Amino acid sequence: STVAISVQGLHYVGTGLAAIALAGVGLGIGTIFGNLLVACARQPNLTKMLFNYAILGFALTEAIGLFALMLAFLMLFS
Amino acid sequence: STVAISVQGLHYVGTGLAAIALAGVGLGIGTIFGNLLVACARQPNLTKMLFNYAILGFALTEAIGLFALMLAFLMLFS
Amino acid sequence: STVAISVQGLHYVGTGLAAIALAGVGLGIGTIFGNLLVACARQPNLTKMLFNYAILGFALTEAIGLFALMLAFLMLFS
Amino acid sequence: STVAISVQGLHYVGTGLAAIALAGVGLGIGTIFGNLLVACARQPNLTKMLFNYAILGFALTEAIGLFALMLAFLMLFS
Amino acid sequence: STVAISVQGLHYVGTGLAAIALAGVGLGIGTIFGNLLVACARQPNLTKMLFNYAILGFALTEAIGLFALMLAFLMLFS
Amino acid sequence: IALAGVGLGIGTIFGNLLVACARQPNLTKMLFNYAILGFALTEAIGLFALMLAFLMLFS
Amino acid sequence: IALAGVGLGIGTIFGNLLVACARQPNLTKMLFNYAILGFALTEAIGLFALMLAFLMLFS
Amino acid sequence: IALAGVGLGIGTIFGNLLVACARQPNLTKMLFNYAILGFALTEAIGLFALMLAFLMLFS
Amino acid sequence: IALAGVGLGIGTIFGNLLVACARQPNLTKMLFNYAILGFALTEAIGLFALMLAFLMLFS
Amino acid sequence: MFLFFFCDLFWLRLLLCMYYCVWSRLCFIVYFNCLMLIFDFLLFCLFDLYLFVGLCLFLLLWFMLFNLYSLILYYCITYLNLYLLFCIVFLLYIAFLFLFCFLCDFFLFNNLLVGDSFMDVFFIRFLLCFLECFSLLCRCLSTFLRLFCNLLSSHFLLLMFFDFFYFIFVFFFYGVFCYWFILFIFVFCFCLLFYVFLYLLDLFAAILQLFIFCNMILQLIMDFLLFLLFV
Amino acid sequence: SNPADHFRPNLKALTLYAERQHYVDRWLHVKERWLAPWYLPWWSPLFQLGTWYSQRSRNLFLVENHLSYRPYKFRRNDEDRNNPY
Amino acid sequence: HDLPEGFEFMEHKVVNKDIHAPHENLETLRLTLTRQDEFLLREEPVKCVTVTGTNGEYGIYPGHAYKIVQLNPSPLTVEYTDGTTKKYFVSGGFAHINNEGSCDVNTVECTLLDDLDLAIAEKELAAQQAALGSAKDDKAKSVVEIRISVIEAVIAALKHH
Ligand SMILES: CCCCCCCCCCCCCCCCCC(=O)OC[C@H](COP(=O)([O-])OCC(O)COP(=O)([O-])OC[C@@H](COC(=O)CCCCCCCCCCCCCCCCC)OC(=O)CCCCCCCCCCCCCCCCC)OC(=O)CCCCCCCCCCCCCCCCC
Ligand SMILES: CCCCCCCCCCCCCCCCCC(=O)OC[C@H](COP(=O)([O-])OCC[N+](C)(C)C)OC(=O)CCCCCCCCCCCCCCCCC
């Protein structure tokens, strides 16, 4: 027979999962600054262009992290 | 017996799981740019072709993340 | 007692789990291009050839994600 | 007392968990082809030979995924 | 009070969890063959011995995967 | 669990930094500044996850 | 589980530290300090997780 | 599951230690000490995890 | 599941060991002893995890 | 049960008849490697190694007439069924395999026993032979599965995104006249960017997937080819 | 569901139904009509090709002694797993 | 008729340690610093030598793994067991490190850092910068860049100490 159930607390669980993705982002960041330093040591003359490309790396990875965070916040308030 | 149950909040759970698919996407993008810097340090004259290939890699990885995000938003609205 | 229970929302959960597969696929693709850059800065005369192989690798690696994605659709539309 | 419950919708969870295994297969393929690109730039003359071995690895790495994929169907259609 | 509950759909979850174990076997095989490609370029004169050792390693990893599949099938049927 | 990567990320930075300082000890200052920048950027994500956790804890 | 990404990170730091000392040992007294700094940051992350693991364990 | 990280981290340290002790054997002693230090930190994190376990298993 | 982070770690160690023995083959004995030490520590962590698993399994 | 239906290529058949009543040169082929199997000169093969060229060309044309034109809205991929693709790949793959087996040369399979004499025959080499024989069939299955899944996933995503774009475009364009017009313009620009990106990705993926489909078959053929040296 | 419905053939024109018994019998009548004439001896390869494999398969069906039950191939409802009849 | 080979007249050969042999703990490194078929140090026992390679700096102590290093214009430091530091500057060459406890640094030009001067480097750097704009073609630009890099390395070495 039919039983429709609306469990309110579940929206917390999913929110937490949406935050786990942030790890794959944050680690992502370090990698870019893990290698940037090495590059600056290998070719110190390009300390500027490499910095800009890493910042672009941060932007693209960071953008993926806000897309996940939007799902995290939407389910926390709904 | 023939019991049947429908639960409302479960779509918050699955959605969150799909968001975790952006952890390896994030990371991956990270990795590309990391290597890019080293490459630009090893062969500084190739600052544009390597940038183009990095953009291509980001585009493909973003397509995968987007494949996942479609499910994440779709279950959240089902 | 003996109850034939049919829960409806579970198909979301499984679907989300399938999306986690992409976390590898995405990452894997990045790895390829990472090495590609390190390979183009180590022997640029082969760039075009290398690019081709990378694309082949991308097409093989991506294939796997699709499998997972298919399952998601099957469970999400059933 | 003795109560027997037959949940019908649980095979989705198992199918999704089986699909999760494809992340490792995708990552392994990406690693194979990344190493291939690096190697070919070091010993171009032998590129062809390397390619064959790479494919072999794919043939020995995709098969595993199939088994996982197989299980999914055996639970998704049952 | 005492309740003896027997759920009929819990073996799917166990089967999927066991199948997840193949994400390590696949990645291990990928690492084996990636290192094989890197080594063959380094010392191509020893291709056959390196191929034999990689095959041995793949066989061991495949044995582990066979154990995982044995558990998965046992739970799926039993 | 989001912190698991974050912390790990920091390690990676402060790993390569060392390898970078040995090769070019003359550039310790610039590399150190970039490492601090990366640490702050990762800490941003860490605070995002921490904010989510605290909100779901006191709610 | 957050500690898994913390402790591992610490190891990575020291790992690289060794490779950095084996290359320029004369710089050890410098590198060590930076390594400590890294441990002083990743560890600070773990505390946050620990804090939650205590707040939920006594509430 | 925290012990998954700790263990791995410890291994990583010794991994690099070998690659270092082979590069400059004359420094083994010093390297060894630092490696131990790293272990003494990673295991510390493990203790907390175990404590939590022993504070929830016996509760 | 903790054992997953143990075995891998052990693998890592021996991996590096081989490379070390390839770079400084005359130093095989010290590397072997240090690798054994690392394996002992990581196996101790795994034994703690097994202790918890058996305590819960028989409880 | 007998269902009578028609493919979605009738207009394309009309165009083919109109535009190919006269001859034309072909210089661009999706899978060119079927034409150049041998790269070192003086090597030749007694096996009919160029038998796959005609089937390859026809398969490319057929799959291109279906898959590439399916990006046009409401265009139908008439053959999009898992088991039908299984039948197609079964035909090609098993036909070539039976061509090699009808040769009645058992030495051709010597390479299936992987490894050297140093390896234990029963516990290592024979298990590798078992796995390789399994891998041949698995390659067939993976080929057809990969072709099916790519089309299905790509078109599902396109349909869903198009539905979202229709929804926001129709029911939220009035915001252009409102004070929150900047938000709508940002969203609309993002949707246009996503539209172009998806179409380019699908165009590239279709051709690449056909390339790999033909490459798998040619790899099956190449695994059993033996080349003699001219003297 | 609705997106899944978009992957169907779009030019279905007609569906015809026929029982297996009926068209099998008609095919057998055709085969008997063409293999009956005297100028086709029973020992010819054509006659044996027509008859021997069918005879062998039917004999295999008749000899079958299975401990399980095989539901009728052409039931009205074969979608219910808990009802083989 | 069999002509000799010029290597037969040099009896100071290279001692290569065998793979399957016991390890030895060494307290000194035999350095051999050479410039244009001329040595400044002849198998001198030193505590350590710091050499700036292409990838980065290398600190060589007794027992270092067998390796080949492609040097770049840079300072080279030699620290004796006594506690005395001697600093040269090199313009290029190679460094061969042996696991038996030897380091042969063969440079095209190895001159004391003291012999170098600051104002001379500054004026030469200014002249090269001025000539870079007037470079005849790409090759001249690359050559001037090489010279500028060498001068900058010299100036940095001088200013460090
Ligand atoms: C009971 C109701 C009726 C139905 C009865 C059916 C009986 C069935 C028996 C049991 C069968 C069981 C098994 C069935 C399996 C089916 C599987 C299936 O469909 O798979 C899909 C699959 C889809 O294939 P496809 O990719 O679409 O390509 C096939 C196409 O035909 C296109 O491929 P193609 O282009 O490569 O083909 C080559 C094409 C090359 O291109 C062309 O030639 C161009 C023309 C194309 C025609 C064919 C396309 C048809 C398009 C739709 C219909 C057109 C309009 C019809 C109008 C009808 C109005 C009511 O050439 C031809 O087609 C040759 C024929 C040309 C005829 C020209 C006639 C000119 C007459 C001029 C008269 C002038 C008179 C002047 C008088 C003046 C007096 C003063 O179908 C097939 O492969 C064929 C299945 C056929 C199976 C055999 C069926 C038995 C035969 C039935 C004949 C009925 C005739 C009586 C009808 C009377 C009206 C009611
Ligand atoms: C080799 C590479 C080829 C690349 C070709 C690139 C083509 C670029 C096209 C630019 C845009 C074209 C717009 C057309 C608009 C038509 C009218 C309309 O309303 O359409 C809307 C339709 C659908 O738009 P819609 O989804 O917004 O429709 C809204 C309608 N409702 C609300 C009811 C749902 O537009 C399209 O579908 C166009 C997609 C084109 C994608 C490219 C297809 C390339 C493959 C086919 C090539 C055919 C060549 C044949 C040559 C002869 C062969 C022998």
How far out from the chain centre does Cα G20 lie?
Answer: 16
Listed residue (J18, J21, J49) closest to J35, CA to CA = J49
Number of domains in chain L: 2
CA distances from L97 to D3, L29, L105 (A): 77, 10, 9
Task: Count interface pairs B-J at CB distance under 8 A.
Answer: 13
Residue type, J183: L
- The answer to whether A24 and B21 have CB atoms below 8 angstroms apart is no
DSSP structure string for H5-41:
HHHHHHHHHHHHHHHHHHH-GGGHHHHHHHHHHHHHH
Smallest CA–CA distance, residue I58 to chain H, in Å, is: 12
Ligand 1 pocket check for J4: Cβ under 6 Å: yes
DSSP structure string for D8-74:
STTHHHHHHHHHHTHHHHHHHHHHHHHHHHHHHHH-GGGHHHHHHHHHHHHHHHHHHHHHHHHHHHH
Q: Tell me the C-alpha distance between G12 and H9, whole Å.
A: 7
Listed residue (I53, I51, I33, I40) closest to I10, CA to CA = I40
Burial tier of L86 (Cβ tally within 10 Å: 0-12, 13-18, 19+): middle
β-sheet bridge partners, residue L35: L107
Strands (E), chain A: 4-5
Residues L145 and L105 in one domain: no
Q: How far, in Å, is the centroid of ligand 2 from the Cα of B68?
A: 26
Token pair of G2 as six digits: 């957050």
Ligand 2 pocket check for J61: Cβ under 6 Å: no
Does residue L121 fall inside a structural domain?
Answer: yes
- Residue whose entry in the numeric block shows the structure tokens 């040591």: A41
Q: Tell me the C-alpha distance between L2 and J95, whole Å.
A: 67
Q: Tell me the C-alpha distance between L24 and L100, whole Å.
A: 9
Listed residue (F21, I17, L87, K38) closest to G35, CA to CA = F21
Residue type, A17: L
Token pair of L34 as six digits: 């050479």
Question: Are L56 and G23 within 8 A, CB to CB?
Answer: yes
Residues L51 and L63 in one domain: yes
Q: How far, in Å, is the centroid of ligand 2 from the Cα of E42?
A: 51
Q: Tell me the C-alpha distance between L17 and L12, whole Å.
A: 16
Question: Are A41 and F20 within 8 A, CB to CB?
Answer: yes
Q: Tell me the C-alpha distance between C18 and C65, whole Å.
A: 9
Task: Count interface pairs B-C at CB distance under 8 A.
Answer: 170
Relative to beta strand B4-7, strand A4-5 is parallel
Query: Which of the 8 DSSP states describes residue B3?
Result: -
Token pair of F43 as six digits: 């800490």
- Residue whose entry in the numeric block shows the structure tokens 């990472």: C34
Token pair of J117 as six digits: 């004499």
DSSP structure string for L1-66:
-----GGGG---------SSS-----S-EEEEEEESS-EEEEEEEESEEEEEESSSEEEE-TTPPP
Strands (E), chain J: 2-5, 43-44, 228-229
Domain assignment of residue L136, given as a range = 117-161
Q: Is L87 helix (H, G, I), strand (E, B) or coil?
A: strand
Question: Are F30 and A20 within 8 A, CB to CB?
Answer: no
To the nearest 10 degrees (0 to 180), the angle between helices D11-20 and C47-76 is 170
Q: How far, in Å, is the centroid of ligand 2 from the Cα of J199?
A: 10
> What is the CB neighbour count within 10 angstroms for residue L145?
14
Token pair of L44 as six digits: 């001198």
Does residue L15 fall inside a structural domain?
Answer: no
Q: Tell me the C-alpha distance between G31 and G48, whole Å.
A: 27
Residues L52 and L109 in one domain: yes
Residues L103 and L51 in one domain: yes
Does residue L4 fall inside a structural domain?
Answer: no
Q: Is H55 helix (H, G, I), strand (E, B) or coil?
A: helix
| I18 Cβ neighbours under 8 A, 6+ residues apart | none
> What is the CB neighbour count within 10 angstroms for residue J14?
10
Listed residue (A65, B19, A72, K3) closest to C16, CA to CA = B19
Q: Is H48 helix (H, G, I), strand (E, B) or coil?
A: helix
Q: Which of A23, A25, A32 sits opposite B33 (nearest CB)?
A: A32
Residues L30 and L100 in one domain: yes
Interface of D with E in 10-39 (CB under 8 A): 10-11, 13-18, 20-25, 27-32, 34-36, 38-39
Token pair of G33 as six digits: 């300090």
Relative to beta strand D2-7, strand E4-7 is parallel
Q: What is the resolution of this structure in A?
A: 3.2
Residue type, A7: V
| F51 Cβ neighbours under 8 A, 6+ residues apart | none
Token pair of F48 as six digits: 């995002």
Pocket test for ligand 2, best of J8, J73, J166 (most atoms within 8 A of CB): J73
Does residue L6 fall inside a structural domain?
Answer: no
Q: Which of E48, E52, E59 sits opposite J127 (nearest CB)?
A: E59
Q: How far, in Å, is the centroid of ligand 2 from the Cα of J68?
A: 11
Q: Is J92 helix (H, G, I), strand (E, B) or coil?
A: helix
Query: Which of the 8 DSSP states describes residue E9?
Result: T
Question: Are D26 and C31 within 8 A, CB to CB?
Answer: no
Does residue L101 fall inside a structural domain?
Answer: yes
Question: Are F8 and G13 within 8 A, CB to CB?
Answer: no
Q: Is G24 helix (H, G, I), strand (E, B) or coil?
A: coil
Residues L90 and L67 in one domain: yes
β-sheet bridge partners, residue J229: J43
| I57 Cβ neighbours under 8 A, 6+ residues apart | none
- The answer to whether I38 and H14 have CB atoms below 8 angstroms apart is yes
| I51 Cβ neighbours under 8 A, 6+ residues apart | none
How far out from the chain centre does Cα C22 lie?
Answer: 4
Ligand 1 pocket check for J20: Cβ under 6 Å: no
Question: Are L56 and F26 within 8 A, CB to CB?
Answer: no
Listed residue (D18, K39, J107) closest to C20, CA to CA = D18
After what residues is chain C interrupted, C–N > 2.5 A? none
Strand order in the sheet with D2-7: A4-5, B4-7, C2-7, D2-7, E4-7
Residue of the CA atom closest to atom 36 of ligand 2: J72
Ligand 1 pocket check for J123: Cβ under 6 Å: no
Residues L112 and L161 in one domain: no
Residues L80 and L38 in one domain: yes
Does residue L2 fall inside a structural domain?
Answer: no
Ligand 1 pocket check for J23: Cβ under 6 Å: no
Query: Which of the 8 DSSP states describes residue G47?
Result: H
Tell me, yes or no, whether chains K and H touch by having 3 or more C-beta pairs under 8 A. no
- The answer to whether D22 and J98 have CB atoms below 8 angstroms apart is no
| L117 Cβ neighbours under 8 A, 6+ residues apart | none
Q: How far, in Å, is the centroid of ligand 1 from the Cα of J6?
A: 10
Does residue L3 fall inside a structural domain?
Answer: no
- Residue whose entry in the numeric block shows the structure tokens 């999400």: C76
Residues L85 and L128 in one domain: no
Query: Which of the 8 DSSP states describes residue L69?
Result: E
- The answer to whether G35 and H44 have CB atoms below 8 angstroms apart is no
E16 is in an annotated binding site: no
| K17 Cβ neighbours under 8 A, 6+ residues apart | J1, J2
- The answer to whether C43 and D41 have CB atoms below 8 angstroms apart is yes
Relative to beta strand C2-7, strand D2-7 is parallel
Relative to beta strand L67-79, strand L93-98 is antiparallel
* L10 backbone φψ class: left, alpha, beta (φ>0; ψ -120 to 50): beta
Residue type, H54: F
- The answer to whether I14 and I58 have CB atoms below 8 angstroms apart is no
Does residue L14 fall inside a structural domain?
Answer: no
Residues L68 and L147 in one domain: no
| B46 Cβ neighbours under 8 A, 6+ residues apart | B39, B40, C40, C41, C44
Residues L159 and L143 in one domain: yes
Residues L29 and L107 in one domain: yes
Q: Tell me the C-alpha distance between L127 and L143, whole Å.
A: 13
| CA angle in degrees (0–180, nearest 5) for F12-F17-F18 | 105
Residues of chain G in contact with residue H48, where contact means CB-CB under 8 angstroms, are 3, 46, 50
Ligand 1 pocket check for J10: Cβ under 6 Å: no
| CA angle in degrees (0–180, nearest 5) for C34-C35-C36 | 90
| CA angle in degrees (0–180, nearest 5) for E45-B39-L52 | 80
